[PDB]
Amino acid sequence: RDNIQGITKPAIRRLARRGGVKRISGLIYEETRGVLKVFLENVIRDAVTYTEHAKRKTVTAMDVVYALKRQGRTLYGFGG
Amino acid sequence: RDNIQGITKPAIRRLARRGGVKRISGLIYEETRGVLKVFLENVIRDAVTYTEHAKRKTVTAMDVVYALKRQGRTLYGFGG
Amino acid sequence: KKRKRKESYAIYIYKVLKQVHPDTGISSKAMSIMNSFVNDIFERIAAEASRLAHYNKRSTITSREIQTAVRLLLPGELAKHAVSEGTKAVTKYTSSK
Amino acid sequence: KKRKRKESYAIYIYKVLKQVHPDTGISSKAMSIMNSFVNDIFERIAAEASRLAHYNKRSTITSREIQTAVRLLLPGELAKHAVSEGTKAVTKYTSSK
Amino acid sequence: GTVALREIRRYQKSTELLIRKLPFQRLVREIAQDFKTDLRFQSSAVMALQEASEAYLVGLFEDTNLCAIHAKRVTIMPKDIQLARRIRGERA
Amino acid sequence: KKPHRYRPGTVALREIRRYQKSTELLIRKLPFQRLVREIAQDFKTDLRFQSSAVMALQEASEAYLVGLFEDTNLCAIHAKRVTIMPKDIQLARRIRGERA
Amino acid sequence: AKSRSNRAGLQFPVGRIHRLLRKGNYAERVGAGAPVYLAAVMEYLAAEVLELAGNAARDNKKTRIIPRHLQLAIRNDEELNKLLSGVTIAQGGVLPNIQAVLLPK
Amino acid sequence: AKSRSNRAGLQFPVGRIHRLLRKGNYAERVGAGAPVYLAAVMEYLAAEVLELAGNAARDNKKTRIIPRHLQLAIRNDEELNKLLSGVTIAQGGVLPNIQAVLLPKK
DNA sequence: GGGGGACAGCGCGTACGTGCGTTTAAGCGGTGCTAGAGCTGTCTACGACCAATTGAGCGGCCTCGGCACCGGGATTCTGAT
DNA sequence: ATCAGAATCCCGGTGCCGAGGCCGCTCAATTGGTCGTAGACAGCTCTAGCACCGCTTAAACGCACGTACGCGCTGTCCCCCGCGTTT
Numbered sequence: 067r068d069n070i071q072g073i074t075k076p077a078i079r080r081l082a083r084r085g086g087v088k089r090i091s092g093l094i095y096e097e098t099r100g101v102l103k104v105f106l107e108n109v110i111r112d113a114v115t116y117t118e119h120a121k122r123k124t125v126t127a128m129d130v131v132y133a134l135k136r137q138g139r140t141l142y143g144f145g146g
Numbered sequence: 147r148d149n150i151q152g153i154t155k156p157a158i159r160r161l162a163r164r165g166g167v168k169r170i171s172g173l174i175y176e177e178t179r180g181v182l183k184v185f186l187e188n189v190i191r192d193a194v195t196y197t198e199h200a201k202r203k204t205v206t207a208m209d210v211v212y213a214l215k216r217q218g219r220t221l222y223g224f225g226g
Numbered sequence: 227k228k229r230k231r232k233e234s235y236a237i238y239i240y241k242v243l244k245q246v247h248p249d250t251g252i253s254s255k256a257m258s259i260m261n262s263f264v265n266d267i268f269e270r271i272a273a274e275a276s277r278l279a280h281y282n283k284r285s286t287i288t289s290r291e292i293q294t295a296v297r298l299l300l301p302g303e304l305a306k307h308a309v310s311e312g313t314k315a316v317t318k319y320t321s322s323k
Numbered sequence: 324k325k326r327k328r329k330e331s332y333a334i335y336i337y338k339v340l341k342q343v344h345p346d347t348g349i350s351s352k353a354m355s356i357m358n359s360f361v362n363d364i365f366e367r368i369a370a371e372a373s374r375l376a377h378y379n380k381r382s383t384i385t386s387r388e389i390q391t392a393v394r395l396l397l398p399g400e401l402a403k404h405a406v407s408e409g410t411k412a413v414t415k416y417t418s419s420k
Numbered sequence: 421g422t423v424a425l426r427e428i429r430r431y432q433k434s435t436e437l438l439i440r441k442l443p444f445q446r447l448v449r450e451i452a453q454d455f456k457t458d459l460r461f462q463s464s465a466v467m468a469l470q471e472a473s474e475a476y477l478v479g480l481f482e483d484t485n486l487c488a489i490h491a492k493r494v495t496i497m498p499k500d501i502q503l504a505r506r507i508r509g510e511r512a
Numbered sequence: 513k514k515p516h517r518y519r520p521g522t523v524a525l526r527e528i529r530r531y532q533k534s535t536e537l538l539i540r541k542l543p544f545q546r547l548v549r550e551i552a553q554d555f556k557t558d559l560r561f562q563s564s565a566v567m568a569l570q571e572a573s574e575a576y577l578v579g580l581f582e583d584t585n586l587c588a589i590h591a592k593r594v595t596i597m598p599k600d601i602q603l604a605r606r607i608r609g610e611r612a
Numbered sequence: 613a614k615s616r617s618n619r620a621g622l623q624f625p626v627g628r629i630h631r632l633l634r635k636g637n638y639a640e641r642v643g644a645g646a647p648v649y650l651a652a653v654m655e656y657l658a659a660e661v662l663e664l665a666g667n668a669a670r671d672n673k674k675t676r677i678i679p680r681h682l683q684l685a686i687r688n689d690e691e692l693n694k695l696l697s698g699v700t701i702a703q704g705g706v707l708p709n710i711q712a713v714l715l716p717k
Numbered sequence: 718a719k720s721r722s723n724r725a726g727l728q729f730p731v732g733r734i735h736r737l738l739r740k741g742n743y744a745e746r747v748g749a750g751a752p753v754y755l756a757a758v759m760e761y762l763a764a765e766v767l768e769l770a771g772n773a774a775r776d777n778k779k780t781r782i783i784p785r786h787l788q789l790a791i792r793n794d795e796e797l798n799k800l801l802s803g804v805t806i807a808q809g810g811v812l813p814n815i816q817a818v819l820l821p822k823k
Numbered sequence: 824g825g826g827g828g829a830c831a832g833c834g835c836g837t838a839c840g841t842g843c844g845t846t847t848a849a850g851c852g853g854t855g856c857t858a859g860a861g862c863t864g865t866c867t868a869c870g871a872c873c874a875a876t877t878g879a880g881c882g883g884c885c886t887c888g889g890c891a892c893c894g895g896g897a898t899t900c901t902g903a904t
Numbered sequence: 905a906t907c908a909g910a911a912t913c914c915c916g917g918t919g920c921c922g923a924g925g926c927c928g929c930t931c932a933a934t935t936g937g938t939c940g941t942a943g944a945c946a947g948c949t950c951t952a953g954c955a956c957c958g959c960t961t962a963a964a965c966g967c968a969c970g971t972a973c974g975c976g977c978t979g980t981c982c983c984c985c986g987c988g989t990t991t
Binding site: 067068069070072073077079080081082083085086087088089090091093094096097098101102103105106107109110111112113114117123124125126127129130131134139141143144145 | 425426428431432438448455468469472474479480481484485490495499505
């Protein structure tokens with residue numbers, strides 16, 4: 067199922083007003099979903115590459131944070 | 147001596163024309179010189195630190211490449 | 227039947243918290259985030275020291291290499307104060323031998 | 324009295340150049356730029372392979388580690404082109420072994 | 421206007437995941453289905469992906485907000501997102 | 513008769529088209545070398561420099577300034593203007609994250 | 613018999629850091645004072661981070677340090693935000709900040 | 718007798734890459750097929766770079782590769798622009814690009 | 824010297840903020856099971872190390888020809904008409 | 905639409921200095937041999953990922969309505985710019 071519509075426009079509205087926006091256009095949501103799809107098409111692909119390299123098929127959180135720090139987004143949290 | 151006047155107005159004008167700027171304001175030059183000072187006082191200071199580790203008082207181009215690749219500005223040129 | 231022994235610094239994190247804040251507690255995910263920060267800073271300083279040792283064609287890392295790595299990686303006075311106290315952290319390390 | 328024996332790829336890149344474009348020359352500045360490019364991408368792939376060996380808690384780098392490093396660092400169809408040419412290079416090297 | 425800025429001030433203090441985790445998990449599984457078939461995901465991996473994606477898009481949203489403020493406007497535009505991705509280097 | 517004067521902006525686009533197909537250093541070499549020595553005098557005195565180091569610093573600074581001017585022009589075009597402003601420069605810097 | 617951590621005046625394990633540096637494949641030989649200096653630097657950074665977290669914890673009357681305190685204490689400092697620029701904190705967020713044009717008139 | 722470069726048919730060296738991997742403090746144990754893989758990858762990347770540079774040189778009626786040809790070759794290719802994003806090329810410049818609103822009005 | 828461009832003011836209207844009924848499925852939580860991550864044993868093929876050998880990689884010289892440079896013809900926008 | 909007028913592209917004459925070919929050294933790749941050792945593979949276990957489903961309700965969809973800001977237009981006033989002269 068196509069779950070890109072699962073990111074509803076009230077959720078994108080709450081996320082945008084979290085960042086400090088008071089007026090959000092209606093066309094913001096489509097490009098926001100596209101950028102989220104690009105980010106989850108890169109990072110999860112890198113995690114799939116790590117999990118395939120590890121002779122596994124369960125995606126761990128350490129592969130996720132490895133993909134995040136590979137692209138320059140260092141994350142402190144799950145995995146260690 | 148102070149060499150803030152060494153970066154002349156036609157030099158910044160030519161750098162803006164190479165950057166594709168149709169019209170240049172008069173206050174562009176001061177902030178452009180300030181950003182140049184900030185970038186130089188980062189890169190040259192890192193090069194001085196690299197030279198000071200190497201027990202030398204001569205700043206070579208290889209330490210300049212080291213300081214540029216430390217800050218993410220990859221350069222393929224003099225030094226190697 | 228334990229699985230494996232962990233490799234973290236949570237007891238040392240709690241001890242450092244006890245020297246700084248004797249009355250303030252910590253949570254588990256805060257210690258996980260702090261341990262991730264410790265591991266990232268350790269990896270950054272170790273990689274910078276390894277690169278700087280490879281730049282001067284030296285296979286041995288001494289205290290001067292990691293002093294220069296701390297100077298390069300840390301801006302502000304946080305390196306410079308670490309220039310001083312870490313040096314005397316060397317000195318009473320050498321005075322205790 | 325020579326100074327030192329340097330390390331460069333002046334012969335190999337010129338050999339590939341005459342393999343592809345036999346009527347095209349190149350300058351020494353472009354030679355230095357190309358050598359710096361080759362050394363930097365080699366350092367990137369070596370660092371990725373070392374980090375992937377430490378990722379699997381392994382002290383040995385095999386062909387699969389550099390396969391994964393090429394698949395990760397290179398985007399586009401050049402990654403799978405390099406994977407195909409590396410697999411056929413490994414089989415033709417082991418067949419000639 | 422007033423209640424929007426009031427919940428903005430509330431939401432600069434709050435820290436919960438605004439994206440519901442089940443549709444985000446379904447989207448993650450849907451995207452990962454294209455790469456490798458029959459994949460499993462740890463829950464901490466999904467939570468880390470959710471937190472990092474939310475932080476990245478909040479940074480993109482505040483970049484969009486400052487871009488729209490710079491454009492003598494207060495309502496954001498998709499071209500602000502395009503300019504932010506172009507200057508940020510995230511636009512291919 | 514009146515002298516032949518081109519329109520304001522046509523000459524500017526003419527040197528943009530000339531300088532987008534050029535590989536020369538717009539900054540003069542010796543004032544830039546004096547500036548590099550003056551900057552390095554702040555950190556450590558009696559420092560010697562190679563000419564290749566000065567040329568590499570000048571090329572990197574010129575490329576960084578060209579990219580900064582490109583982002584500034586993008587910000588000025590986004591603000592419905594053809595003239596760049598200092599606010600465009602600080603906007604491009606804070607999007608790039610170069611302001612600490 | 614006697615640990616090198618207390619002989620160096622620190623508390624972090626110098627032997628663990630030296631063992632991690634030895635098999636971390638950074639150099640052929642590892643010196644003695646370099647892991648001591650590393651332990652001192654990370655101990656000072658840990659002390660600064662934890663004391664700013666204690667500042668943020670006593671701002672909101674909390675006797676337990678949460679990562680909200682870490683998020684509010686890693687971004688208010690200009691030097692720590694400069695060092696940790698692209699660092700993402702789990703269960704974090706942004707500082708409370710509103711632009712001047714967004715204020716009501 | 719026979720070198721490993723001619724054994725795998727690759728122009729790029731294998732012994733130099735293997736020595737650099739062994740003495741580069743990368744891993745304790747270094748494989749045998751990995752330098753061959755690295756030499757093949759470097760050879761293909763070099764061949765693609767010089768092929769695009771030769772295309773740019775034959776576009777400009779030149780038989781010698783100037784760094785302007787490298788600038789026009791790397792930045793025009795989207796894979797080389799994406800991978801070598803922060804790479805500054807010495808003695809180069811920018812692609813010929815003028816914005817639509819900066820064009821003169823007709 | 825000036826003229827186009829940044830900036831300020833004012834009306835259009837529409838597009839998004841706000842409120843509420845309604846639907847939509849999100850969230851919490853017991854249950855099983857089972858594929859698989861991880862741990863343990865073995866022994867083995869692959870790699871580090873020592874030493875003699877060599878042939879290709881690199882320093883030095885050269886001579887040449889690809890491109891640097893000049894002017895005059897032709898082209899091509901370009902302002903005034 | 906239509907005019908000449910400067911900026912620039914191109915072609916021929918020529919010249920000149922880095923670039924590749926050659927000479928010759930020399931040092932790291934090559935190969936033979938040996939011993940260490942990390943992991944390939946197979947059983948064994950135990951664990952959480954996934955699927956499921958029922959109850960409660962948080963929240964999204966969407967319609968109605970409103971009003972305030974993008975945006976088109978107009979006026980203004982001045983800021984660099986093209987060009988001439990001097991350092």
